[PDB]
Symmetry: D2
Subunit: 133 residues, 4 copies
């Protein structure tokens, strides 16, 4: 119920010579779906005040996707850890799941030079976007 929803229009440049969306495009669309999450950690989205660092990703390529039809990225929180969070995410096209992903990010405080227990205000915000399939 609580996931973020991001509609994207595929581009010719995101295909490859096989005629489908290229596999390296999927992490690009998944990162696009994390936008609202990034915004919770860095409200002005300034790279001066950037906090989010990926440490792991996994993607299952379930069905091929095509240039010419929109896709929808669903992005939710599978686990809120201490200094990390594990995202669950899916890409759909034509109402069919085509890619499923998980990613783990660490909230890194560059000012203090250490991973930072996610502040409480953020945890509350994140709890209302939990998605556990």
């Amino acid at each position: 119920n609580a996931m973020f929803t991001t509609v994207i229009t595929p581009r010719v440049s995101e295909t490859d010579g096989v005629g489908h969306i290229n596999n390296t495009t999927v992490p690009v669309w998944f990162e696009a779906g994390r936008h609202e999450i990034f915004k919770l950690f860095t409200p002005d989205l300034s790279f001066k005040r950037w906090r989010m660092v990926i440490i792991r990703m996994e993607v299952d390529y379930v069905n091929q996707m095509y240039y010419g039809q929109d896709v929808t990225v669903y992005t939710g929180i599978e686990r809120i850890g201490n200094t990390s969070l594990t995202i669950y995410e899916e890409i759909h096209q034509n109402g069919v799941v085509c890619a499923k992903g998980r990613s783990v990010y660490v909230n890194f405080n560059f000012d203090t030079g250490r991973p930072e227990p996610i502040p409480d205000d953020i945890r509350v915000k994140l709890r209302e976007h939990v998605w556990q399939p």
Copy 2:
């Protein structure tokens, strides 16, 4: 007349300088050409593709940033015999940031030669001439 395409910049589109990287700009211009490609190839199928770029010009007027939407405006400047010239701009925060021209030819991948743009495509393109 012109097409309007709203895009949400991505972190991967910036570089270490902290702005949108110059190579993103042509990617965004190509995205604004979508409705043009559709006039040439209505089902956007690659087996029926007929567009080949021959020239591109880009003026980078102002820096763009991750975190705010940009808008691509794309229109036809010239419909030539085999080529067409696209005039195109990208705006962020109500400011023109990039201005572009690109030239494509109508291309027949079956015979390997550029080909005159068909009357019925010219007809469809004429609405979108600046």
Copy 3:
């Protein structure tokens, strides 16, 4: 050992605003490192005769990478299945393992419309490049 080695020069457009190589670049570099495997399946690298379809990937981001120094992609065959294979792969910079990956491809025969068991001749040649960590 027996894995493939691919030296790559990072590009400015591959970094992001945080100032390191962006995470979406790593799967692009891994794919570049699979070049000799693709050639085994499609000797002329023609897309009309393409067969390699990715079905899954995972990446561990061990250390940050930077524009300004080359990287080395090491790509080995971890497993040769029937219709699929598993690739184990790493990216090093400055002599430090910065990313570790696994990917699974299927040999998809676009002519017969379904997955193809890997032909005996490719199987023998793939065996020349196995690497299990």
Copy 4:
């Protein structure tokens, strides 16, 4: 005088038409500029970056393909006060396939303005002047 950069094309750099996508050509041109960036900024630190592009043009002469290396030739066509014009070509199979001209300025981010190229950089640039027919 010119720099020479050999690049191995990647599957992700093609599109569904079966050839290298036009948006890859500026990415390859930016890679050929690497040693020019180094003249401005020896250690390629983003903290000390100076170059901002103001204009680019590309002539696409012949289509390029995945599966054969390409070579980028890059030289300085003119050194202005605050700007320089770079002339660049990309070759595949011994044939010129793209020609480019780009204009960068030396930019001060601390003051937010282009500024005269300093004498010590100008001295370096003069050695890489390339002005073809």
